[PDB]
């Protein structure tokens, strides 16, 4: 429900009409297919909130 944005060093997702940066996560995003098709795709971490929970 947002747009991916960078401040020059870090990547965030925001709502479109008001700047409010959030960490990119598996809850903020959806997957479709692999890296090869999309024109202008960028490499970044996507955080998964379950993985530190499994680390408990």
């Amino acid at each position: 429900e947002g747009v991916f944005v960078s401040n020059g060093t870090h990547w965030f997702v925001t709502q479109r009409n008001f700047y409010e940066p959030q960490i990119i996560t598996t809850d903020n995003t959806f997957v479709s297919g692999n890296c090869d098709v999309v024109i202008g795709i960028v490499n970044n971490t996507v955080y998964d909130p379950l993985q530190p929970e499994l680390d408990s």
């Binding site: 747009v3 479109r16 959806f30 479709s32 297919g33 098709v37 999309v38 024109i39 202008g40």
Partner: protein
């Protein structure tokens, strides 16, 4: 407010209830169909009053 044209078209796909990856995964097909359809306007307006 500037936005890249393909990202503006992904917002417009969301507005008709089609998911954004349907644009980015088909972007050349969508751009070719637009460029082709504008050529039909050009020819139709040149062809008949």
């Amino acid at each position: 407010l500037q936005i890249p044209f393909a990202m503006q078209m992904a917002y417009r796909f969301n507005g008709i209830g089609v998911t954004q990856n349907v644009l980015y995964e088909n972007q050349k097909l969508i751009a070719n169909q637009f460029n082709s359809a504008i050529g039909k306007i050009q020819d139709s307006l040149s062809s008949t009053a």
